[PDB]
């Protein structure tokens, strides 16, 4: 049909395939031997390669640089990143509902219909939520129909904006499309459709970009210094002092005072002055882009101790118990709260099992304390007292033999 | 004309004269809701006053109180006039730049010293044993660091810091002794248990083996006599206490243990120098004094390192003062005399002169 592709091929399978074939031929012409080699290894070992690409960032900097799987990751990512689309395109793929924190079956595979009750439950669960996505996946340019593989009852229909890296390629008989997820998903709408005799949920999804430095702390640090150098300057006398008193403070007295309900149980002029000065220090230069930050948190933040048998996430029951307790919930820190632009593990918190991966909207109160030399090493972002975080999703991964959790969360104030 | 060396710690100040082989004075780094009281003199009262430690985790956090510590050092401990002596000060690794500046300002504007210098503690330690290349494990009362050093240069990006040291070990020993059936809870009792820790604790080569032995044989039991003749018995607490260094979860901490921070620090260095670091693991500070710590560190790092790696743990008997000793040697080298910041240089450039000379 047309001289220019649409933004969405919809059910036009045949034009979608023909088009992606030409595009695969064209793109093959721009990949070097190593990128082609990476692509070839991907076809042989896609699942493991994709798995590695999802959790890669969470280890010691030195464990990452010495994983041999890092070559395949970087080379494959360069191949994808090279070919950026010049206008939006929509894609289709199936997900498990567990992916969006719906930890039951929408329906069994043998069932043909979805209850209105499962539908409303699902809508309530996935509504008003940014779900972080990572790693390589194969997507389709057309809506699956009679005769395509349909592994789950959940079909995602995703609009990818202009400049999304996309790698069309051929594997045996098939034309495939590879992307590296590096964004959050908003589900704008769900509808129940029917394909080949069975009801499916179709999620209309769009994308929210955030700066996510992951293990590239150097890039992260450059970025932060570059945006918060002036911040050092525009601070007043007390602010600079109270913040440094917090910084090489001090946070322990302030934060216990906050946690205790001090201001409204046992007022203190000196500390109440201090809380409000720091808050005003964080309103000074609000976060100038959507930003992912990482916090390795202590079990106490989630009502556990290091000896609680519920903190043994190697037993699947305790993961489930944790999800039921926190997943979907909002969570409030009466204290000021410390995070990093980096995702890597560190000596000071090498054994903490719970990682908060927090979405910070542009203009949120907060500061890159690490532009201030001297405690600029934690690559630290300080978030305001009383901050609330919606926990969208809980994932688990293996660090050696220890299971740890990643809490996909969002700053909602 | 004789330079002073003041090694300021979280728990103790070690002070003396460059050229001496030991500090002349070692005293508590404390100041007493009626004010100026310092060291053993800060026990003028633990009543109307309570004790304050101006130095926390190796970092100066109260400047008014630190000035009192230094006043006490010059006038009461060493009995010298600060105006008449160049003064070498020590600082923690990764000490904030603003801190070094503030130390410089105080020594010139408050104490009117003719010259001074700020030296990194771990570098002085390494230097005491005649080395210029090595990785230092420095563990005192407040903080422990791993500081890799190549040809006289600390490598800051590879420095590891654990806020767990002697005072946490003392508190843990109070707790598990209390769990044994004794009662150690007061500040005076904390001092008694520091003394027990210092006399009776050791690091087990194999912790789980030593634990089984304990519950069986009783040849690991030792006795200790309290100030009023009550004699008490200590068993597996002897090695459970400093085991905390290798297993900080004992104290409810989720950081790497001391062997793992040493390995992490080495892995952050250029591959080409790692052999030099493994072959030159130097220990300093009071909390490295435990019998068996060197052997245990050897075994743990062996487990982590490539099987071909030559590993050596150097633990001098004078470990506890090696920072001080290193400062005494440094301050008296002819090639160091250039490095002193004079009062004139401070008058010309400001406090920020420390960065371009220290
Ligand atoms: N990955 C990180 O966690 C991270 C990132 C950047 C900076 N930092 C820095 O680490 C230093 C201290 O460590 P920290 O901030 O991770 O620990 P912290 O001082 O925030 O917390 C200490 C203990 O209190 C608990 N806690 C904190 N808030 C709580 C609440 N609302 N309810 C119940 N328990 C609570 C924690 O679980 C932990 O056990 C700070 O100087 C900070 O700037 C840490
Ligand atoms: N023989 C010993 N065995 C075990 N621990 C000891 C021994 N001697 C001293 N200590 C401990 O070492 C600590 C003091 O050592 P040091 O003077 O190196 O620390 P500091 O410089 O005051 O503190 P930091 O270096 O942490 O700032 C105290 O906690 C003390 O109990
Ligand atoms: C010989 C000696 C060594 C020493 O290192 O004391 C230092 C200094 C001391 C200051 C507080 C007390 C009451 C006044 C003490 C005078 C002390 C000289 C004591 O507080 C420590 O004890 C702490 C507490 S318990 C521990 O493990 N660190 C370390
Ligand atoms: Ca020290």
Q: Are strands B55-56 and B25-28 parallel, antiparallel or unpaired?
A: unpaired
Residue A37: CB within 6 Å of ligand 1? no
Dihedral sign computed on CA atoms, order B133, B161, B300, A215: negative
Residue with tokens 């590695």: A52
Burial string for B193-211 (b: 16+ CB within 10 Å, else e) reads bbebbeebbbbbeeeeebe
Per CB-CB distance under 8 Å, the chain B contacts of A373 are 96-98
Counting from 1 in the atom list of ligand 1, the atom nearest the Cα of A297 is: 3
Cα A64 to chain center, whole Å? 19
CB-based contacts of B249, cutoff 8 Å, min separation 6? A306, A351
Domain extents in chain B: 1-121+323-358, 122-163+256-322, 164-255
Ligand 3 pocket by C-beta < 6 Å: which residues?
Answer: B 11-12, 28, 30, 40, 51, 141, 166-167, 170, 187, 190-191, 194
Query: Ramachandran region of residue A94, left (φ > 0), alpha (ψ -120 to 50) or beta?
Result: beta
Integer CA distances (angstroms), B193 to B197, B234, B238, B242, B286, in order: 6, 11, 11, 13, 15
246-265 in A: which are within 8 Å (CB) of B? 248, 250
Q: How many other C-beta atoms are found inside a 10 Å radius of the C-beta of residue A31? A: 19
3-state secondary structure of A244: helix
CB-based contacts of A157, cutoff 8 Å, min separation 6? A90, A91, A92, A143, A202, A203, A204, A205
Q: Are strands A388-399 and A330-332 parallel, antiparallel or unpaired?
A: antiparallel
- Cα(A63)–Cα(A59) distance, integer angstroms: 6
305-324 in A: which are within 8 Å (CB) of B? 305-306
Tell me the three-class secondary structure of chain B, residue by residue: CCCEEEEECCCEEEEEEECECCCCEEEECCECCCCCCEHHHHHCCCCCCCCECCEECCEECCHHHHHHHHHHHHHHHCCCCHHHCCEEEEECCCCCHHHHHHHHHHHHHHCCCCEEEEEEHHHHHHHHCCCCCEEEEEECCCCEEEEEEECCEECHHHCEEECCCHHHHHHHHHHHHHHHCCCCCCHHHHHHHHHHHHHHCCCCCCHHHHHHHHCCCCCCCEEEECCCCCEEEECCHHHHHHHCCCCHHHHCCCCCCHHHHHHHHHHCCCHHHHHHHHCCEEEECHHHCCCCHHHHHHHHHHHHCCCCCCCCEECCCCHHHHHHHHHHHHHCCHHHCCCCEEHHHHHHCCHHHHCCCC
Distance from CA of A113 to the nearest CA of B (A): 49
Q: Do the chains contact at A374 and B255, CB–CB below 8 Å?
A: no
Reference A368, options A380, A353, A356; nearest CA is: A380
CB-based contacts of A59, cutoff 8 Å, min separation 6? A67, A344, A345, A399
Q: Do domains B1-121+323-358 and B122-163+256-322 have the same CATH topology?
A: yes
Is B261 near chain A, with CB under 8 Å? yes
Please give the method by which this entry was determined.
X-ray
Residue with tokens 């005491």: B128
- Radius of gyration, alpha carbons of chain A: 23
- Cα(A340)–Cα(A358) distance, integer angstroms: 10
Integer CA distances (angstroms), A23 to A26, A90, A135, A206, in order: 5, 16, 22, 24
Q: How many other C-beta atoms are found inside a 10 Å radius of the C-beta of residue A354? A: 21
Integer CA distances (angstroms), A304 to A41, A353, A391, B109, B290, in order: 43, 11, 17, 51, 33
- Cα(A82)–Cα(B277) distance, integer angstroms: 42
What phi and psi, each to the nearest 5 degrees, are found at residue B150? Answer: -125, 120
| The domain over range A212-413 is classified in CATH as 3.20.20.70 | no
* Contact by Cβ (8 Å): B313, B283: yes
Between CA B231 and CA B234, with CA B232 as vertex, the angle to 5 degrees is: 145
Q: Do the chains contact at B96 and A349, CB–CB below 8 Å?
A: no
Residue with tokens 């002070």: B15
Helix A251-259 vs helix A237-247: angle between axes, to the nearest 10 degrees? 90
3-state secondary structure of A87: coil
3-state secondary structure of A147: coil
Residue A224, burial from CB neighbour count under 10 angstroms (0-12, 13-18, 19+): buried
Residue B28: CB within 6 Å of ligand 2? no
Reference A371, options A212, A247, A255, A236; nearest CA is: A247
CATH T-level fold of B164-255 = Actin; Chain A, domain 4 (3.90.640)
Residue B308, burial from CB neighbour count under 10 angstroms (0-12, 13-18, 19+): exposed
At the fourth CATH level, which superfamily is domain B1-121+323-358? Answer: ATPase, nucleotide binding domain (3.30.420.40)
Tell me if the bond preceding A250 is cis, omega within 30° of 0. yes
- Cα(B102)–Cα(B116) distance, integer angstroms: 13
Element (H, E) at A52: helix A33-55
Residue with tokens 């059936």: B181
Per CB-CB distance under 8 Å, the chain A contacts of B61 are 248, 250
Interface test mutation site (partner A, options B63, B256, B269, max chain A beta carbons within 10 A): B256
CB-based contacts of B242, cutoff 8 Å, min separation 6? B169, B197, B201, B202, B203, B290, B293
Residue B59 CA to ligand 4 centre (angstroms): 10
Closest residue in A to B249 (Cα) is: A306
Residue with tokens 């047309």: A2
Helix residue ranges, H only, A56-159? 61-65, 69-82, 116-126
- Cα(B324)–Cα(B12) distance, integer angstroms: 12
Between CA B341 and CA B347, with CA B342 as vertex, the angle to 5 degrees is: 105
CB-based contacts of A223, cutoff 8 Å, min separation 6? A211, A213, A341
Closest residue in A to B94 (Cα) is: A374
Element (H, E) at A391: strand A388-399
| The domain over range B122-163+256-322 is classified in CATH as 3.30.930.10 | no
Residue B33 CA to ligand 1 centre (angstroms): 29
Distance from CA of B5 to the nearest CA of A (A): 25
Cα A314 to chain center, whole Å? 23
| The domain over range A1-211 is classified in CATH as 2.60.40.420 | no
What phi and psi, each to the nearest 5 degrees, are found at residue A390? Answer: -85, 125
Helices and strands (H and E) in chain A: how many: 10, 13
Element (H, E) at A318: helix A316-326
Is B96 near chain A, with CB under 8 Å? yes
* Contact by Cβ (8 Å): B89, B116: yes
Which letter does DSSP use for residue A140 in this model?
B
Q: How many CA atoms lie within 13 A of A287 on its CB side?
A: 25
Residue B127, burial from CB neighbour count under 10 angstroms (0-12, 13-18, 19+): buried
| Residue minimizing CA distance to atom 40 of ligand 1 | A338
> Tokens standing for A39?
């692509």
* Contact by Cβ (8 Å): A336, A251: yes
* Contact by Cβ (8 Å): A356, A409: yes
Reference B93, options B69, B51, B126; nearest CA is: B126
Is B59 near chain A, with CB under 8 Å? yes
Reference B276, options B306, B311, B301, B307; nearest CA is: B311
Domain with CATH 3.90.176.10 in chain A: 1-211, 212-413
Which letter does DSSP use for residue A384 in this model?
P
What phi and psi, each to the nearest 5 degrees, are found at residue A237? Answer: -60, -65
Residue B248, burial from CB neighbour count under 10 angstroms (0-12, 13-18, 19+): buried
Element (H, E) at A223: helix A217-234
Residue with tokens 């044989």: B217
> Tokens standing for B330?
């440094």
Distance from CA of B66 to the nearest CA of A (A): 15
Distance from CA of B162 to the nearest CA of A (A): 6
Residue A54 CA to ligand 1 centre (angstroms): 26
Bridge partner list, A72 = none
Reference B87, options B78, B96, B95, B99; nearest CA is: B78
N-terminal to C-terminal alpha carbon distance within chain B: 21
* Contact by Cβ (8 Å): B156, B145: no
Residue B34, burial from CB neighbour count under 10 angstroms (0-12, 13-18, 19+): exposed
Resolution in A: 2.3
Q: How many CA atoms lie within 13 A of A129 on its CB side?
A: 24
Q: Do the chains contact at B254 and A373, CB–CB below 8 Å?
A: no
Per CB-CB distance under 8 Å, the chain A contacts of B97 are 373-374
N-terminal to C-terminal alpha carbon distance within chain A: 49
* Contact by Cβ (8 Å): B320, B285: yes
- Cα(B43)–Cα(B31) distance, integer angstroms: 9
Helix B166-180 vs helix B187-200: angle between axes, to the nearest 10 degrees? 100
Residue with tokens 């894609």: A91
The widest CA-to-CA distance across chain B, in whole angstroms, is: 70
Q: How many CA atoms lie within 13 A of A392 on its CB side?
A: 24
Between CA B304 and CA B313, with CA B309 as vertex, the angle to 5 degrees is: 80
């Amino acid at each position: 049909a047309f001289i220019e592709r649409p933004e969405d091929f919809l059910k036009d399978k045949e034009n979608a395939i023909q088009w992606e074939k030409k595009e695969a031929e064209r793109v093959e012409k721009n990949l070097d031997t190593l990128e082609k080699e990476a692509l070839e290894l991907y076809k042989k070992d896609s699942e493991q390669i994709s798995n590695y690409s999802q959790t890669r960032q969470y280890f010691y900097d030195y464990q990452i640089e010495s994983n041999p799987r890092e070559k395949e990751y970087k080379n494959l990512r360069n191949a994808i990143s090279k070919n950026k689309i010049d206008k939006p395109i929509n894609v289709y793929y199936f997900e498990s509902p567990e992916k969006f924190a719906f930890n039951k079956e929408i329906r069994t595979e043998n069932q043909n219909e979805i209850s209105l009750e499962k539908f409303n439950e699902l809508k309530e669960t996935i509504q008003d939520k940014l779900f972080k996505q990572d790693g390589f996946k194969d997507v389709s340019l057309y809506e699956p129909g009679n005769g395509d593989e349909k592994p789950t009852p959940l079909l995602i229909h995703l609009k990818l904006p202009k400049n999304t890296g996309m790698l069309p390629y051929i594997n045996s008989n098939d034309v495939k499309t590879l992307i590296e997820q590096d964004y959050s998903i908003k589900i704008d709408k769900i509808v129940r459709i029917v394909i080949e005799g069975k009801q499916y949920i179709k999620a209309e999804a769009s994308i929210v970009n955030s700066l996510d430095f992951k293990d590239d702390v150097s890039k992260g640090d450059l970025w932060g210094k570059e945006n918060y150098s002036d911040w050092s300057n525009k601070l007043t006398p007390n602010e600079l002092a109270d913040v440094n008193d917090y910084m090489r403070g001090g946070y322990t007295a302030i934060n216990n005072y906050l946690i205790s309900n001090g201001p409204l149980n046992n007022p203190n002029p000196e500390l109440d002055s201090k809380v409000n000065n720091i808050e005003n220090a964080l309103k000074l230069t609000p976060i100038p882009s959507n930003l992912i930050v990482y916090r390795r948190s202590g079990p106490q933040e989630f009502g556990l101790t290091l000896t609680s048998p519920e903190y043994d996430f190697n037993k699947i029951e305790n993961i489930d118990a944790f999800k039921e307790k926190w997943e979907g919930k909002v969570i409030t820190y009466p204290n000021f709260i410390s995070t990093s632009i980096g995702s890597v593990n560190m000596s000071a918190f090498a054994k903490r099992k719970i990682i908060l991966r927090i979405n910070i909207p542009k203009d949120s109160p907060g500061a890159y304390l690490s532009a201030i030399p001297g405690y600029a090493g934690e690559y630290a972002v300080l978030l305001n007292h009383g901050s609330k975080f919606k926990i969208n999703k809980v994932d688990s991964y293996k660090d050696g033999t220890v299971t740890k959790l990643i809490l996909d969360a969002t700053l909602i104030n | 004309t004789t330079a002073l060396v003041c090694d300021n710690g979280s728990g103790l100040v070690k002070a003396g004269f460059a050229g001496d082989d030991a500090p002349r004075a070692v005293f508590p780094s404390i100041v007493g809701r009626k004010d100026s009281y310092v060291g053993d003199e800060a026990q003028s009262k633990r009543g109307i006053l309570t004790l304050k430690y101006p130095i926390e985790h190796g970092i100066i956090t109260n400047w008014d109180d630190m000035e009192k510590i230094w006043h006490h050092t010059f006038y009461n401990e060493l009995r010298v006039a600060p105006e008449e002596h160049p003064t070498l000060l020590t600082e923690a690794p990764l000490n904030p730049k603003a801190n070094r500046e503030k130390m410089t300002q105080i020594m010139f504007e408050t104490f009117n010293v003719p010259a001074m210098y700020v030296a990194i503690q771990a570098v002085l330690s390494l230097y005491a044993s005649g080395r210029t290349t090595g990785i230092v494990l420095d563990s005192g009362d407040g903080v422990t660091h791993n500081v890799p050093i190549y040809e006289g240069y600390a490598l800051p990006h590879a420095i590891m810091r654990l806020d767990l040291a002697g005072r946490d070990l003392t508190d843990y020993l109070m707790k598990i002794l209390t769990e044994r059936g004794y009662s150690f809870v007061t500040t005076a009792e904390r001092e008694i248990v520091r003394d027990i820790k210092e006399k009776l604790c050791y690091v087990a080569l194999d912790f789980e083996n030593e634990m089984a032995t304990a519950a069986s044989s009783s040849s690991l039991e030792k006795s200790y006599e309290l100030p009023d003749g009550q004699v008490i018995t200590i068993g597996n607490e002897r090695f459970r206490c400093p085991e905390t260094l290798f297993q900080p979860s004992f104290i409810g901490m989720e950081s790497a243990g001391i062997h793992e921070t040493t390995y992490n620090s080495i892995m952050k260095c250029d591959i080409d120098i790692r052999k030099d670091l493994y072959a030159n693991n130097v220990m300093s500070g009071g909390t490295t004094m435990y019998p068996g710590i060197a052997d245990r560190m050897q075994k743990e790092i062996t487990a982590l390192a490539p099987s071909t790696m030559k590993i050596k743990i150097i633990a001098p008997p004078e470990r506890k003062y090696s920072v001080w000793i290193g400062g005494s040697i440094l301050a008296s080298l002819s090639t160091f005399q250039q490095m002193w910041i004079t009062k004139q240089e401070y008058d010309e450039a400001g406090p920020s002169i420390v960065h371009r000379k220290c």
